[PDB]
Amino acid sequence: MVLDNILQVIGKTPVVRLHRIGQSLPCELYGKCEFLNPGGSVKDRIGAAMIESAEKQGKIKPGDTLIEPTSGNTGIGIALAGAVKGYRVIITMPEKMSHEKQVVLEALGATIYRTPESHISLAKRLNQEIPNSYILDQYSNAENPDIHYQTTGQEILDDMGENLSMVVMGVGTGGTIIGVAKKLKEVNPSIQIIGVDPIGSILGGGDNNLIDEYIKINDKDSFLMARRLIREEGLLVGGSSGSAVWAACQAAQRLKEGERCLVILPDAIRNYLTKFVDDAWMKAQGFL
Amino acid sequence: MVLDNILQVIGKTPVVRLHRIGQSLPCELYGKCEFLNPGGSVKDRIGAAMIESAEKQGKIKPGDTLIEPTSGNTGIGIALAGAVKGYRVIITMPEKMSHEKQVVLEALGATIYRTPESHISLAKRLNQEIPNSYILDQYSNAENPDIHYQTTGQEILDDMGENLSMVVMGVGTGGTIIGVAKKLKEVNPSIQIIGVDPIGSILGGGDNNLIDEYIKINDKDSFLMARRLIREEGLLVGGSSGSAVWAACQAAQRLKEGERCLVILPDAIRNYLTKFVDDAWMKAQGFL
Numbered sequence A, B: 001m002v003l004d005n006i007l008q009v010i011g012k013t014p015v016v017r018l019h020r021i022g023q024s025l026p027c028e029l030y031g032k033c034e035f036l037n038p039g040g041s042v043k044d045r046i047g048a049a050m051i052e053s054a055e056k057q058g059k060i061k062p063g064d065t066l067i068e069p070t071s072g073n074t075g076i077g078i079a080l081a082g083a084v085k086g087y088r089v090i091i092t093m094p095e096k097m098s099h100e101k102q103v104v105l106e107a108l109g110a111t112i113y114r115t116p117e118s119h120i121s122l123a124k125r126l127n128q129e130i131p132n133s134y135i136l137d138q139y140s141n142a143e144n145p146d147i148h149y150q151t152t153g154q155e156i157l158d159d160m161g162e163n164l165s166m167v168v169m170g171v172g173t174g175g176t177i178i179g180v181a182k183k184l185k186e187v188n189p190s191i192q193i194i195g196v197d198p199i200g201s202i203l204g205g206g207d208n209n210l211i212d213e214y215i216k217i218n219d220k221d222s223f224l225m226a227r228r229l230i231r232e233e234g235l236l237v238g239g240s241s242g243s244a245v246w247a248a249c250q251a252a253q254r255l256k257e258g259e260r261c262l263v264i265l266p267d268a269i270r271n272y273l274t275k276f277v278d279d280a281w282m283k284a285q286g287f288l
């Protein structure tokens, strides 16, 4: 198909059967390939949607400065959509973020202000200092579950229908899981929504809950499963996809033959070529 | 959609209008996003097709060893499809290939034998030494234009039809351009087929031609255009996409208003995060 710009490519991600990873399970295991999005992550969706929603509400217009405070957990989504739509993008964050993420944000034209909640305070000060500027923060935004309710969740319903017993996805930022859970439980309340909570220093952060269970995953188990996804399924994913699939192999053990479990594969291999993808790094971290 | 494996995701790549890059041209400029393929390149297509064709001819079966001699110009396509389909993959090459490409090939389970035409001689020796082994070489294969005639070229016809005045694409390995040119000139013989020939040390190699013109592009011009594709169009491409778009801006200057030029964007940003994407590297190479 012919499109106006790359933002129109975001979404409608394919679902692939995980034939080798799912061998040890009685159920069928599937992976939704969010890492194939043009920015390389499920996070492409929220960035584009936040700009579209703020434009529709007349809060921003091209030429304006967008200020994105981040704890390094958010994607390149605001920078990507900002570059496409003609916004100046400023990002505030702690000095903790990787060279791989920083070089792409900068190539997309974003200005990064590194801080030693100083990054949130910096965004608020920049918002008052810079004329025609607006803060776009993925955290406490409240319209984050809506995009995943309107798109990601609808795609899962369109592709797999009511023949879906379990969905496994990450809990950070928090938009994906809440939006998808809300959409799926409206038509299938018996569906099991599994929250992926990485507790490691690398991948981790720092009555009727829509999220049925929260599984804790360390870094070793995430990276080893990510290596299985690349070697056994040809899925060029990052560590968070390994976290999600490891959690699914644990939770899906309860499911029966003919039942299906879907895992969101949120990140790409791009930022990890000098990390878990490298056997020397795996050995050095004591993961091999 | 729901699929059996990641190889079924290869192809049907979107065409996006290049609204900012095309401003200096009287014609409309478009980019076919081959870098969005699951292996990150147009080269995904040939790798999967070579294995499918050799399987159909009964020359190989899963469990067999596939030997891929390469001058580092070929993609991760054989390794990717080999991992998915259950083949042992051996790659022979000169010590010249990047850490980024090597780490992904190895993560996909390929064994790499580095040589100081020693890599072609090594493949031939391994073919005689290893039982149930078969050589899959992208060069001199002769069935390389067929896949691009059957798929890439057909997609261009399906998306843009006869309202297409020019197609710009790379000449290495040689399958893409010949296969696409043959398909397009059968329905539109007036179409202009522009061959992209990078002459730089980084991106370069070493009566009725289907290829109308061969444009030479140095490394500086390729990398600066690649930086424009990321910053102005949000296309997370590699240097060869910059080569192709730079060549299109030169050749398409002859086209008129309402005419359309399509450029194949063959590679992704993944292998270049410590290279052209980095301003420090651009400065060090004397490109800034």
Ligand code: NA
Pocket: A008, A009, A010, A011, A012, A013
């Ligand atoms: Na898409």
Ligand code: NA
Pocket: A129
């Ligand atoms: Na002031």
Ligand code: NA
Pocket: B008, B009, B010, B011, B012, B013
């Ligand atoms: Na596709």
Ligand code: NA
Pocket: B129
């Ligand atoms: Na021998």
